[PDB]
Design a protein around this ligand. Structure first.
Ligand SMILES: CCCCCCCC/C=C\CCCCCCCC(=O)O[C@H](COC(=O)CCCCCCCCCCCCCCC)COP(=O)(O)OCCN
Ligand SMILES: CCCCCCCC/C=C\CCCCCCCC(=O)O[C@H](COC(=O)CCCCCCCCCCCCCCC)COP(=O)(O)OCCN
Ligand SMILES: CCCCCCCC/C=C\CCCCCCCC(=O)O[C@H](COC(=O)CCCCCCCCCCCCCCC)COP(=O)(O)OCCN
Ligand SMILES: CCCCCCCC/C=C\CCCCCCCC(=O)O[C@H](COC(=O)CCCCCCCCCCCCCCC)COP(=O)(O)OCCN
Ligand SMILES: CCCCCCCC/C=C\CCCCCCCC(=O)O[C@H](COC(=O)CCCCCCCCCCCCCCC)COP(=O)(O)OCCN
Ligand SMILES: CCN1C[C@]2(COC)CC[C@H](OC)[C@@]34[C@@H]5C[C@]6(O)[C@@H](OC)C[C@@](OC(C)=O)([C@H]5[C@@H]6C(=O)c5ccc(OC)cc5)[C@@H]([C@@H](OC)[C@H]23)[C@@H]14
Ligand SMILES: *[C@@H]1O[C@H](CO)[C@@H](O[C@@H]2O[C@H](CO)[C@@H](O[C@@H]3O[C@H](CO)[C@@H](O)[C@H](O)[C@@H]3O)[C@H](O)[C@H]2NC(C)=O)[C@H](O)[C@H]1NC(C)=O
Ligand SMILES: COCC(CCO[C@H]1CC[C@@]2(C)C(=CC[C@H]3[C@@H]4C[C@@H]5O[C@]6(CC[C@@H](C)CO6)[C@@H](C)[C@@H]5[C@@]4(C)CC[C@@H]32)C1)COC
Ligand SMILES: COCC(CCO[C@H]1CC[C@@]2(C)C(=CC[C@H]3[C@@H]4C[C@@H]5O[C@]6(CC[C@@H](C)CO6)[C@@H](C)[C@@H]5[C@@]4(C)CC[C@@H]32)C1)COC
Ligand SMILES: COCC(CCO[C@H]1CC[C@@]2(C)C(=CC[C@H]3[C@@H]4C[C@@H]5O[C@]6(CC[C@@H](C)CO6)[C@@H](C)[C@@H]5[C@@]4(C)CC[C@@H]32)C1)COC
Ligand SMILES: *[C@@H]1O[C@H](CO)[C@@H](O[C@@H]2O[C@H](CO)[C@@H](O)[C@H](O)[C@H]2NC(C)=O)[C@H](O)[C@H]1NC(C)=O
Ligand SMILES: *[C@@H]1O[C@H](CO)[C@@H](O)[C@H](O)[C@H]1NC(C)=O
Ligand SMILES: *[C@@H]1O[C@H](CO)[C@@H](O)[C@H](O)[C@H]1NC(C)=O
Ligand SMILES: *[C@@H]1O[C@H](CO)[C@@H](O)[C@H](O)[C@H]1NC(C)=O
Ligand SMILES: *[C@@H]1O[C@H](CO)[C@@H](O)[C@H](O)[C@H]1NC(C)=O
Ligand SMILES: *[C@@H]1O[C@H](CO)[C@@H](O)[C@H](O)[C@H]1NC(C)=O
Lengths: 173, 122, 1129
């Protein structure tokens, strides 16, 4: 099926970024018509100005200069039931580093009961200039190396101890 | 299936003047509902002429008060127990004929038929 | 003088034959569903003949005006009763009396031949020993049903109701249009409030408001329905649906209940029943065995023909020809083209010609009827005559079914094949020496079929629209005799409740319950007795210095347990590779580096084993080979990942081999190792008999191919998913003209070729998948033609016959060879109690002595007070029985519990429970006042002490939960002290005591086999998580029971372990190409594409797991059965 993953917290200047908003349906087989508002606020700015609107197939964007011709769609294509709301920001700059809101509005169809559900996904990004590797990866790599080295040391210590013991046992004869 | 098994005797005759119980009882498996149940009663004196209706059950009981015989007909049955026999008052020598009960109890698709000869015996 | 005339006629042989033939033709006449008007006179003739027989009996068993004559025999009562009820029915206006003697006249068939009385008596005396087993069965069923009643109380009625967009809550619950129907299920979807339970669709809320899931009958609300549902679980009839409904209502975390019952009720109680029936039949068998010109031309042609080779290529050439003919028949498939169909036809012609040549060469040398003496010669003549008739006809419609008869030539291999000869011997023995048992089984099936027909025919015809949406007859009805027989046969095969639901909804709950339980008991007992009868009627300056150190390090227990722990850690690191790993994103990298750590450490461990043992002594060991192969796979994966060759198809497929990492535990776990060794020791004979089974199933598969060969193709209305009717689409030319709305769908489990035939036969013989197969086969008309509902209604007989032979006699041969192999293996061991290590054998043979003990009367007297009379009163059997009566009353007042009971009723129940608790505590304190010294002579007193403490504690937490932070999901669990309070019944339940002691004695071997099964489940669940975690959400794979997560994979695998639902779990994976699926359907947050599973790997996975689980379950069955035999005998 589908799973909801959290978007990456940090972006890198000059390169591309992919902000994810996975609003998986609570029931997979239910037909739905999903559209979405994407907005955000700048760091140090207290507002929420709509930046784009995704519909059945077409993506619409405002006159905002921070995303004029530098954002593309990377959600579900040609399905009318999105279940994936991903913005691909090409040429990420310092214009966009703040708090994005993903307002996914889903009209779920049923027998004769159309439900009109709204979900909000808030994600914070902060563009940097150097790609900092995540703390979890660094800690895991350091722990891997420490475990390998300490276990090699334990193995060689046991081998030399057994070598001394077997020498003491064999020089007896 | 073939039809609906309706328990109606071949013929029954009532003494004149006394009240008569016109029987129409069916034995249907389905739990009847008072929203889709269909019933009607027909009276015939011909052999091959047009037939007219005088008593119906369609979401409720309807007595049309037929102008030929009388307003004698009355509801004396119970659809929930599958016995919808009716009540007849002031039996007269002109009441002799053949009476047919037509039944349609959803979700069954078979129209149960019940034939009786309304005569009078001493 | 007066009775002397009617004595010779009674014992006259032709009178017995007259009764024979009149009973037989009466049985033929009851077969008719709606007999014509002229059969009434024939019924009059039948009853007149019966009255004539009874008059003879009256005038023969009584002299000088005797009243009762044939009243000293059982079946004579039956005859008198049926004749009386026939004459009672003469009053037409007396009716419900026709269905009173006609279901009793059918019982006359039991006396069809003198001799069946002995078999029926033997069956009745054999079911007599089942008293303790059935009382324990009902005790465990009631205990488990009370557990289910307190846990899932009204849970099954949870239904996703839509939030009111507006009689309030009274006409909103009872609308049935406000719930969620799962797109063509005619039943609201079960839902839940807690996690790991049913997820309501967006805009729906789960409310405990509805009728019930299946026609009002599968529910836990009342103990009666709880008893029915857990009988369903114990018999494993369609329990996967109850499994899914209960786990969707209450939550996935409740499967622990099923894991117990499926092991405790469904598996162990069946083992007890089989063991005790086998014990009774062994006793019966041992008792029975201990009590018991032209002449010149003829001579020269005979010299020419007989005086030929005997060993060199006159009987081996024929075997080779038979094998080649079998291979040519198996080469048939669909769609077969010309220059191959012609090849097969000419091969068949050449083979029948050469067989005719051999027959004539044999008959002109053996001078019939001296040729027709050895049996095999007669069989060869018959089969070759059938082949000549079929080749001469070449157009026989509508029974070209005899064309497949040539497959019987394969049985000519039985001359040289000892195991095939043994199978043929068993098949013939059933119709020969066990002919009485076979006839009893057939007569009982016929009697149940006609009883069901007479009781429920008019019902299934008039009440039909309650169980069907088109108001037409369902697939399995009892309106006519053939369908009634099919339902009775399906009940024997195992699927009783699915038709018993329709029977309840049509023709009376109590009547259908009685009928179906009598069938489920009697017919299954007869089948088991026949199976048992057939089973038993078959028979260095630095180099070596470092080498010592490395050997010591490897054999050190420190290193051994360290390696075992890290193997467990590495195996468990695989279970986190869900479809949620991408949302985890931190344990993802943690495990990415733990994989490197584990593979480096395993490489070091392998090098240490090398430098300690030597290459020869390391590659001699199979376990070392397995570890070396796994290490090599991990090393190649690491090298590919380091070099950057990760995003390649071959490397990605080899990464799936990481699921083999748990296999290292085989060499480390002692019980797992010994069970694997025991399996490998028996695998040769198992393989030989499996080859026999393959040959038999190949015969049946070629027959099925001949019959169907792609007649399963049908047009599905693409907009809805249902089959077209022939009124609209009749053939392929029309399903290619409807266009886009017509797909010409296949079944995906069919008989197109021999491989698909093997798959379909496996489904049919496992009894989970045979449904749609038989539906399509019966519907089929002909190649490239639209099927019609039950057009070939009598092709049900094909599959019936298959289940009779290749699923019953084949299973009998398989079980017999397993018993023989294990008997020889344990006689060779010395030797007994395999599947156990040394520590477990010590535990077992010490526990044997522990259980074989008696109390050494260590209760002399209390110490000088009124406690003397207190002891004298407490120790009495009257008190010891009064306590049991109180426990039984507590059990009954819990059975009284029911969902949605009144507040006053609940208060009354609470007060009664409090009174029972205080009386139990008074009993405990009286025993304490008696024997304060020890009170602990036997563990039963300790069990009573702990259970009363636990009941008090549970009552206290129940009060606390009501008075403080409340949670029903915990209150229901904590209200389970009542279960132990009634489990105290085992104290006085003798027989139940020894059966539970046998279970507790067999626990070690069962635990070893369960550990091996759990390892197998872990490996196959990781395989599922790797492969089928993204397949489509078709029939068997839904939003909850799938392969996405480790929990879901393990629940699906536990479902499959009991062979249940594997057809449904394989159906979505068999999909290969559109429009069945989409090969490039992207779904977040995963980089994988496509929702179609590979059919080859799916079939391999499911078939291999079915075979492995079948072997493991057979091993568990034999372990429990031999433990019971050793305990009792
Ligand atoms: C044992 C007596 C079997 C007598 C079979 C008579 C078949 C009755 C019959 O003609 O029903 C008509 C056809 O029924 C059948 O096709 C019978 C099918 C034969 C297989 C079932 C045999 C049942 C007992 C053997 C087990 C329907 O009307
Ligand atoms: C041996 C066989 C004994 C069979 C005894 C049958 C007794 C039947 C009595 C009966 O009908 O009571 C019904 C008992 O409920 C059952 O389902 C019976 C379950 C009996 C299981 C026996 C298994 C052995 C109650 O009907 P209801 O719940 O009020 O109606 C619900 C309609 N949707
Ligand atoms: C043997 C198993 C007995 C199980 C009895 C369960 C009856 C269910 C029940 O009493 O529910 C209540 C139903 O009341 C009844 O039991 C009346 C149903 C009578 C149907 C005929 C009962 C036959 C009894 C066995 C023969 C509610
Ligand atoms: C007693 C057991 C008797 C035999 C039981 C099961 C035999 C299973 C035969 C599977 C035949 C599959 C037919 C087939 O076409 O599958 C084809 C692939 O066949 C296979 O690879 C399945 C092979 C099954 C091997 C089972 C191994 C069992 C291991 C025992 C341990 C491809 O299907 P497609 O949809 O055309 O693409
Ligand atoms: C001993 C062998 C068998 C004993 C069977 C005991 C279990 C039978 C329990 C019967 C029972 O408690 O009646 C339940 C109703 O309980 C009541 O409150 C009615 C009166 C209860 C009196 C209980 C008498 C106990 C007799 C002990 C023997 C059945 O409820 P339901 O009609 O099925 O509700 C479903 C709504 N659609
Ligand atoms: C071992 C599985 N298998 C094999 C056997 C043995 O071959 C000789 C032949 C084929 C038949 O179907 C496949 C069987 C029966 C049909 C049934 O429906 C089935 O369900 C899938 C499971 C069974 O039972 C259990 C507890 O596994 C019954 C059960 C039934 O009818 C029943 C159960 C309990 C009972 O008394 C409490 C009375 C009747 C099995 C065996 O008999 C114990 C018998 C089952
Ligand atoms: C699962 O949790 C939901 C969430 O609350 C529960 O829904 C609740 O259901 C009850 C009735 O079942 C509602 O109570 C009210 O009852 C009156 C009649 O007395 C009626 O008029 C109201 O319309 C309503 O039905 C309650 O409002 C409702 N909760 C919410 C938030 O709407 C549900 O009962 C739980 N189910 C289980 C099995 O735990
Ligand atoms: C005592 C005799 O000891 C053994 C001697 C060889 C024997 C008789 C036995 C087992 C395998 C047997 C073979 C299985 C093969 O299976 C078949 C049958 C199916 C063929 C598709 C393939 O080969 C037999 C020809 C082949 C076979 C029946 C021929 C005979 C073989 C028993
Ligand atoms: C278009 C359809 O293409 C088919 C063409 C024939 C083909 C290749 C296919 C399926 C069955 C195949 C057969 C199954 C039989 O199985 C075998 C093998 C195993 C034997 C136990 C029995 O026979 C093959 C001789 C037999 C077979 C492998 C030979 C070839 C058959 C695909
Ligand atoms: C996360 C919480 O949600 C549930 C998810 C499934 C899960 C983890 C739950 C508890 C029991 C678990 C089961 C115990 C059974 O034990 C096993 C294993 C051993 C079998 C001999 C028997 O069953 C599992 C199939 C069964 C199991 C391991 C599979 C998974 C089950 C919690
Ligand atoms: C396939 O079925 C079609 C109809 O479903 C056949 O076409 C004709 O169908 C009508 C039915 O009203 C028959 O009366 C005609 O006799 C049919 N045509 C012929 C030539 O017989 C069609 O024949 C069937 N077969 C093929 C190969 O298309
Ligand atoms: C994101 O969009 C770009 C187009 O700018 C495309 O090349 C890329 O493949 C997309 N990525 C995903 C994961 O869809
Ligand atoms: C991003 O846009 C700036 C605008 O001047 C340009 O200089 C730069 O090369 C662009 N980078 C990429 C990766 O497109
Ligand atoms: C960033 O924002 C400022 C102020 O809104 C704007 O003038 C500038 O052009 C933006 N950067 C780019 C690369 O357009
Ligand atoms: C309800 O659905 C309409 C479209 O029919 C949509 O415009 C509206 O935004 C939805 N409601 C909310 C709260 O989003
Ligand atoms: C498929 O079914 C629908 C509704 O059941 C019907 O309207 C449609 O005509 C069917 N398709 C064809 C090709 O008849």
């Amino acid at each position: 099926g589908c799973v909801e993953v959290d978007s990456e917290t940090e972006a890198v200047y000059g390169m591309t970024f992919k902000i994810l908003c996975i609003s998986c349906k609570r029931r997979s087989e239910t037909n739905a018509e999903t559209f979405t508002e994407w907005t955000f606020r700048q760091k140090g700015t207290e507002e929420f100005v709509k930046i784009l609107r995704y519909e059945n197939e077409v993506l619409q964007l405002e006159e905002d200069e921070r995303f004029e011709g530098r954002v593309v769609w990377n959600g579900s294509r040609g399905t009318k039931d999105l279940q994936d709301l991903s913005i691909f920001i090409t040429n990420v700059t310092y214009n966009h580093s703040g708090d994005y809101e993903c307002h996914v509005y889903r009209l779920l169809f049923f027998e004769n009961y159309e439900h009109n559900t709204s979900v909000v996904k808030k994600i914070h990004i902060e563009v940097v200039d150097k790609a900092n590797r995540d703390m979890a990866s660094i800690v895991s790599e350091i722990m891997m190396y420490v475990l390998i080295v300490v276990l090699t040391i334990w193995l060689v210590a046991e081998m030399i101890y057994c070598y001394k013991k077997i020498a003491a046992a064999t020089e007896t004869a | 299936g073939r039809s609906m098994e309706v328990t109606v005797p071949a013929t029954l005759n009532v003494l004149n003047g006394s009240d008569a119980r016109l029987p129409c009882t069916f034995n249907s498996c389905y739990t009847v509902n008072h929203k889709q149940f269909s019933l009607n009663w027909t009276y015939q004196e011909c052999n091959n002429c047009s037939e007219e209706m005088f008593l119906q059950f369609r979401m409720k009981i309807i007595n049309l008060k037929l102008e030929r015989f009388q307003d004698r007909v009355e509801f004396s049955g119970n659809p929930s127990k599958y016995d919808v026999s009716v009540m007849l008052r002031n039996v007269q020598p002109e009441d002799e004929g053949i009476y047919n009960c037509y039944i349609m109890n959803p979700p069954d698709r078979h129209r149960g038929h019940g034939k009786i000869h309304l005569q009078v015996l001493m | 003088p007066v009775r002397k005339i009617a004595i010779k006629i009674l014992v006259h042989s032709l009178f017995s034959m007259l009764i024979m033939c009149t009973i037989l033709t009466n049985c033929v006449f009851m077969t008719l569903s709606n007999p014509p008007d002229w059969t009434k006179n024939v019924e009059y003739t039948f009853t007149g003949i019966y009255t004539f027989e009874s008059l003879i009996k009256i005038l023969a068993r009584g002299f000088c005006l005797e009243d009762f004559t044939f009243l000293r025999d059982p079946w004579n009562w039956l005859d008198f009763s049926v004749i009386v009820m026939a004459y009672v029915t003469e009053f037409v206006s007396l009716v419900s009396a026709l269905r009173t003697f006609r279901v009793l006249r059918a019982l006359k068939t039991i006396s069809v031949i003198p001799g069946l009385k002995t078999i029926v008596g033997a069956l009745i005396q054999s079911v007599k020993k089942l008293s303790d087993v059935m009382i324990l069965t009902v005790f465990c069923l009631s205990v488990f049903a009370l557990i289910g009643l307190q846990l899932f109380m009204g849970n099954l009625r949870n239904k996703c109701l839509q939030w009111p967009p507006s009689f309030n809550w009274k006409d909103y619950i009872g609308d049935d249009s406000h719930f969620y129907v799962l797109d063509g299920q005619k039943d609201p979807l079960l839902c839940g409030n807690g996690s790991d339970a049913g997820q309501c669709p967006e805009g729906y809320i789960c409310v405990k408001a509805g009728r019930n899931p299946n026609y009002g009958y599968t529910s836990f609300d009342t103990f009666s329905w709880a008893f029915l549902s857990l009988f369903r679980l114990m018999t494993q009839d369609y329990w996967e649906n109850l499994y899914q409904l209960t786990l969707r209502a209450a939550g996935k975390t409740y499967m622990i209940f099923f894991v117990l019952v499926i092991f405790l009720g469904s598996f162990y109680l069946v083992n007890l029943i089989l063991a005790v029936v086998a014990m009774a039949y062994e006793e019966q068998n041992q008792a029975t065995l201990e009590e018991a010109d032209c002449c010149d031309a003829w001579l020269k042609v005979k010299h020419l023909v007989n005086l030929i080779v005997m060993d060199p290529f006159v009987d081996l050439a024929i075997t080779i020809c038979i094998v080649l003919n079998t291979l040519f028949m198996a080469m048939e498939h669909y769609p077969m083209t010309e220059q191959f169909s012609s090849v097969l036809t000419v091969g068949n012609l050449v083979f029948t010609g050469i067989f005719t040549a051999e027959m004539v060469l044999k008959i002109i040398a053996m001078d019939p009827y001296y040729y027709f003496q050895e049996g095999w010669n007669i069989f060869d003549g018959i089969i070759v005559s059938l082949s000549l008739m079929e080749l001469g006809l070449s157009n026989v419609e509508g029974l070209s079914v005899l064309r497949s008869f040539r497959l019987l030539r394969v049985f000519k291999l039985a001359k040289s094949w000892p195991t095939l000869n043994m199978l043929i011997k068993i098949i013939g023995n059933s119709v020969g020496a066990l002919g009485n048992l076979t006839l009893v089984l057939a007569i009982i099936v016929f009697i149940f079929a006609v009883v069901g027909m007479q009781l429920f025919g008019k019902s299934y015809k008039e009440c039909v629209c309650k169980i069907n949406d088109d108001c037409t007859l369902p697939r399995w009805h009892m309106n006519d005799f053939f369908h009634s027989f099919l339902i009775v046969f399906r009940v024997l095969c195992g699927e009783w409740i699915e038709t018993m639901w329709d029977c309840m909804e049509v023709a009376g709950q109590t009547m259908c319950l009685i009928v179906f339980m009598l069938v489920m008991v009697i017919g299954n007992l007869v089948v088991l007795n026949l199976f048992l009868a057939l089973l038993l009627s078959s028979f260095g300056k630095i180099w070596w210095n470092l080498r010592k150190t490395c050997y010591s390090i490897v054999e050190h227990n420190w290193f051994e347990t360290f390696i075992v722990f890290m193997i467990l850690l590495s195996s468990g690191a695989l279970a986190f590779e869900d479809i949620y790993i991408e949302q985890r994103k931190t344990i993802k990298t943690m495990l990415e580096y733990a994989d490197k750590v584990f593979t480096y450490i395993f490489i070091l461990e392998m090098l240490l084993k090398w430098v300690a043992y030597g290459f020869q002594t390391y590659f001699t060991n199979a376990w070392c080979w397995l570890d070396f192969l796994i290490v090599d796979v991990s090393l190649v994966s690491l090298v590919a990942n380091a070099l950057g060759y990760s995003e390649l198809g071959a490397i990605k497929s080899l990464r799936t081999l990481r699921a083999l990492r748990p296999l290292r535990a085989l060499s480390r776990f002692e019980g797992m190792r010994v069970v694997v060794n025991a399996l490998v020791g028996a695998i040769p004979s198992i393989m030989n008999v499996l080859l026999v089974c393959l040959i038999f199933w190949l015969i049946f598969s070629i027959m099925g191919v001949n019959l169907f060969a792609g007649k399963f193709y049908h047009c599905v209305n693409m907009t809805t998913g249902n089959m077209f009717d022939i009124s609209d689409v009749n053939n392929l030319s029309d399903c290619q003209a409807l266009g886009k709305q017509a797909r010409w769908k296949n079944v995906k489990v069919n008989f197109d070729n021999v491989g698909a035939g093997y798959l379909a036969l496996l489904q049919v013989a496992t009894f989970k998948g045979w449904m749609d197969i038989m539906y399509a086969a019966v519907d089929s008309r002909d190649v490239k033609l639209q099927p019609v509902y039950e057009e070939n209604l009598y092709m049900y007989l094909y599959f019936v016959i298959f289940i009779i032979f290749g699923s019953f006699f084949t299973l009998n041969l398989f079980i017999g060879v397993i018993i023989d192999n294990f008997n020889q293996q344990k006689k060779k061991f010395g030797g007994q109690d395999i599947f156990m290590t040394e520590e477990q054998k010590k535990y077992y043979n010490a526990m044997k002595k522990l259980g074989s003990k008696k109390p050494q009367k260590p209760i002399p007297r209390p110490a000088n007070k009124f406690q003397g009379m207190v002891f004298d009163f407490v120790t009495r059997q009257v008190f010891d029985i009064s306590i049991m009566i109180l426990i039984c009353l507590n059990m009954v007042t819990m059975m009284v519990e029911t969902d949605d009971q009144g507040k006053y009723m609940t208060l009354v129940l609470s007060r009664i429970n409090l009174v029972f608790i205080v009386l139990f505590t008074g009993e405990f304190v009286l025993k304490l006042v008696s024997l304060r010294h020890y009170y602990f002579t036997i563990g039963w007193n300790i069990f009573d002490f702990v259970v009363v403490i636990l009941s008090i504690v549970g009552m206290f937490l129940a009060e606390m939960i009501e008075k403080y932070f409340v949670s029903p999901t915990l209150f229901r669990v904590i209200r389970l002290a009542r279960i132990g309070r009634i489990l105290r019944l085992i104290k006085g339940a003798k027989g139940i005591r020894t059966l539970l002691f046998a279970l507790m004695m067999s626990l070690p071997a069962l635990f070893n086999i369960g550990l091996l099964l759990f390892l197998v489940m872990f490996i196959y669940a990781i395989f599922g998580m790797s492969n089928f975690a993204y397949v489509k959400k078709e029939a068997g794979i839904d939003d909850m029971f799938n392969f996405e997560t480790f929990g879901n994979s393990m629940i699906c695998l536990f479902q499959i372990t009991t062979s249940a639902g594997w057809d449904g779990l394989l159906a979505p994976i068999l999909n290969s190409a559109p429009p069945d699926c989409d090969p490039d359907t992207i779904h977040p947050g995963s980089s994988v594409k496509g929702d179609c599973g590979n059919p080859s790997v799916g079939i391999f996975f499911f078939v291999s797991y079915i075979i492995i689980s079948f072997l493991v379950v057979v091993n568990m069955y034999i372990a429990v059965i031999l433990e019971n035999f050793s305990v009792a005998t």
